[PDB]
Design an enzyme around this catalytic site. Structure first.
Site, PDB file in Angstrom:
ATOM      1  CE1 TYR A  30       0.519   4.395  -6.027  1.00  0.00           C
ATOM      2  CE2 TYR A  30       0.343   5.917  -4.359  1.00  0.00           C
ATOM      3  CZ  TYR A  30       0.845   4.917  -4.950  1.00  0.00           C
ATOM      4  OH  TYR A  30       1.804   4.203  -4.138  1.00  0.00           O
ATOM      5  CE  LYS A  72      -0.569   1.502  -3.972  1.00  0.00           C
ATOM      6  NZ  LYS A  72      -0.035   0.333  -4.384  1.00  0.00           N
ATOM      7  CB  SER A  95      -0.694  -0.039   1.438  1.00  0.00           C
ATOM      8  OG  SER A  95      -1.973   1.021   1.069  1.00  0.00           O
TER       9      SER A  95
HETATM   10  N1  LIG Z   1       8.290   5.168  -2.686  1.00  0.00           N
HETATM   11  C1  LIG Z   1       7.885   4.310  -3.528  1.00  0.00           C
HETATM   12  O1  LIG Z   1       8.736   3.873  -4.269  1.00  0.00           O
HETATM   13  C2  LIG Z   1       6.600   3.445  -3.126  1.00  0.00           C
HETATM   14  C3  LIG Z   1       5.888   4.359  -2.025  1.00  0.00           C
HETATM   15  C4  LIG Z   1       4.703   3.359  -1.636  1.00  0.00           C
HETATM   16  C5  LIG Z   1       4.263   2.508  -2.296  1.00  0.00           C
HETATM   17  N2  LIG Z   1       4.935   2.014  -3.212  1.00  0.00           N
HETATM   18  C6  LIG Z   1       4.219   0.952  -4.240  1.00  0.00           C
HETATM   19  O2  LIG Z   1       5.210   0.064  -4.512  1.00  0.00           O
HETATM   20  C7  LIG Z   1       4.902  -0.985  -5.422  1.00  0.00           C
HETATM   21  C8  LIG Z   1       6.343  -1.295  -6.343  1.00  0.00           C
HETATM   22  O3  LIG Z   1       6.196   0.115  -7.017  1.00  0.00           O
HETATM   23  P1  LIG Z   1       7.974   0.641  -7.094  1.00  0.00           P
HETATM   24  O4  LIG Z   1       8.085   1.975  -6.293  1.00  0.00           O
HETATM   25  O5  LIG Z   1       8.895  -0.712  -7.062  1.00  0.00           O
HETATM   26  O6  LIG Z   1       7.967   1.105  -8.660  1.00  0.00           O
HETATM   27  P2  LIG Z   1       8.528   0.438  -9.891  1.00  0.00           P
HETATM   28  O7  LIG Z   1      10.042   0.065  -9.944  1.00  0.00           O
HETATM   29  O8  LIG Z   1       8.052   1.167 -10.988  1.00  0.00           O
HETATM   30  O9  LIG Z   1       8.306  -0.831 -10.037  1.00  0.00           O
HETATM   31  C9  LIG Z   1       6.651  -1.083 -10.660  1.00  0.00           C
HETATM   32  C10 LIG Z   1       6.396  -2.394 -10.882  1.00  0.00           C
HETATM   33  O10 LIG Z   1       4.970  -2.900 -11.273  1.00  0.00           O
HETATM   34  C11 LIG Z   1       5.283  -3.442 -12.617  1.00  0.00           C
HETATM   35  N3  LIG Z   1       3.624  -3.364 -13.092  1.00  0.00           N
HETATM   36  C12 LIG Z   1       3.225  -2.312 -13.620  1.00  0.00           C
HETATM   37  N4  LIG Z   1       2.149  -2.525 -14.373  1.00  0.00           N
HETATM   38  C13 LIG Z   1       2.136  -3.616 -14.299  1.00  0.00           C
HETATM   39  C14 LIG Z   1       1.111  -4.761 -15.002  1.00  0.00           C
HETATM   40  N5  LIG Z   1       0.044  -4.180 -15.865  1.00  0.00           N
HETATM   41  N6  LIG Z   1       1.315  -5.789 -14.930  1.00  0.00           N
HETATM   42  C15 LIG Z   1       2.288  -6.265 -14.530  1.00  0.00           C
HETATM   43  N7  LIG Z   1       3.283  -5.748 -13.862  1.00  0.00           N
HETATM   44  C16 LIG Z   1       3.175  -4.280 -13.827  1.00  0.00           C
HETATM   45  C17 LIG Z   1       6.363  -3.103 -13.238  1.00  0.00           C
HETATM   46  O11 LIG Z   1       6.673  -3.974 -14.218  1.00  0.00           O
HETATM   47  P3  LIG Z   1       6.601  -4.054 -15.876  1.00  0.00           P
HETATM   48  O12 LIG Z   1       6.640  -2.462 -16.093  1.00  0.00           O
HETATM   49  O13 LIG Z   1       7.837  -5.018 -16.138  1.00  0.00           O
HETATM   50  O14 LIG Z   1       5.282  -4.555 -16.161  1.00  0.00           O
HETATM   51  C18 LIG Z   1       7.436  -3.060 -11.969  1.00  0.00           C
HETATM   52  O15 LIG Z   1       8.021  -4.367 -12.027  1.00  0.00           O
HETATM   53  C19 LIG Z   1       3.659  -0.173  -6.150  1.00  0.00           C
HETATM   54  O16 LIG Z   1       2.330  -0.838  -5.705  1.00  0.00           O
HETATM   55  C20 LIG Z   1       3.760   1.244  -5.564  1.00  0.00           C
HETATM   56  O17 LIG Z   1       2.627   1.748  -5.440  1.00  0.00           O
HETATM   57  C21 LIG Z   1       6.139   2.827  -3.717  1.00  0.00           C
END
Ligand SMILES: NC(=O)c1ccc[n+]([C@@H]2O[C@H](COP(=O)([O-])OP(=O)(O)OC[C@H]3O[C@@H](n4cnc5c(N)ncnc54)[C@H](OP(=O)(O)O)[C@@H]3O)[C@@H](O)[C@H]2O)c1
Length: 240
Positions: A149, A153, A135
């Site tokens: 977004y 969440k 989340s």
């Molecule tokens: N500070 C932060 O970074 C932060 C804070 C709070 C929450 N989050 C959450 O952490 C999670 C991971 O995000 P991240 O920060 O690691 O960003 P990220 O590096 O952009 O990773 C996003 C992942 O989601 C995959 N994805 C997106 N659409 C997809 C789809 N339709 N089917 C399959 N895979 C898909 C992408 O892979 P492909 O493009 O290869 O499909 C990538 O592996 C997300 O749910 C984000 O909301 C992140």
């Protein structure tokens, strides 16, 4: 051997969660799902038989059907599901908000999650497995231009509570990972931030410039440990 499905495993937090699982238990298996087939095939190659790559868009039910088919054939069970794939765009004020992009964000962040949970539940009930949702602090705090977004969440947090309540054989936990050094934060700084109030964007550029973004392996180690050891009953269904 415990078998974890991790969505969004091609980069960022989800990739770090896969690596942390393999580092923390020698027998564990991981099914890594995302659209980027080349990245996943490299994960498979580097992991010595312990990773099964399933390439595909999770918003297509064909992806989810193939994922379960291949997991069951190769490893025979599912013990944990880490729901990590997500998108942040559209980052737009409500007065400018493109609802077609909102529909796409909900397909990824919520509707595909409903489908993934429905299709994995028969296996997860057998293993008494744990569902782990990634989340965000935006699920309760209204960051400028993030209404789509953040609302998705909030819906995800509620879906986790509902799942835990309907399915007493499994566990479910919704975990915000803090702020993490990934492409999603880079997108905030370099792409989406031009649609945000300057003061709101300055929070995220300050975190970056002050070296306060977490390495993905740091929160990733906590999801990995939960995936391997299970959700504690007193937090079942909760958001933390
Ligand atoms: N500070 C932060 O970074 C932060 C804070 C709070 C929450 N989050 C959450 O952490 C999670 C991971 O995000 P991240 O920060 O690691 O960003 P990220 O590096 O952009 O990773 C996003 C992942 O989601 C995959 N994805 C997106 N659409 C997809 C789809 N339709 N089917 C399959 N895979 C898909 C992408 O892979 P492909 O493009 O290869 O499909 C990538 O592996 C997300 O749910 C984000 O909301 C992140």
């Amino acid at each position: 051997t415990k078998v974890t499905v991790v969505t969004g495993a091609s980069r960022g937090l989800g990739e770090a969660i896969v690596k942390q699982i393999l580092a923390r238990n020698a027998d564990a298996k991981v099914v890594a799902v995302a659209r980027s087939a080349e990245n996943l095939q490299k994960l498979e190659k580097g992991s010595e038989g312990r990773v099964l790559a399933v390439a595909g868009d999770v918003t297509r039910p064909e992806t989810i059907h193939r994922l379960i088919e291949e997991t069951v054939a190769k490893f025979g069970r599912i013990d944990s599901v880490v729901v990590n794939a997500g998108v942040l765009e559209p980052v737009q004020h409500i007065d400018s908000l493109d609802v077609d992009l909102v529909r796409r964000l909900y397909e990824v962040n919520l509707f595909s999650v409903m489908d993934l949970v429905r299709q994995t539940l028969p296996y997860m009930r057998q293993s008494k497995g744990s569902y782990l949702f990634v989340s965000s602090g935006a699920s309760t705090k209204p960051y400028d231009a993030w209404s789509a977004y953040g609302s998705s969440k909030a819906a995800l947090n509620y879906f986790c509570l509902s799942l835990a309540t309907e399915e007493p054989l499994i566990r479910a936990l919704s975990i915000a990972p803090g702020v993490v050094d990934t492409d999603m934060q880079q997108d905030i700084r370099e792409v989406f931030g031009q649609n945000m109030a300057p003061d709101a964007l300055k929070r995220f550029t300050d975190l970056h410039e002050n070296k306060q973004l977490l390495a993905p392996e740091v929160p990733g180690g906590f999801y990995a440990s939960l995936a391997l050891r299970g959700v504690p009953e007193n937090l079942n269904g909760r958001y933390v």
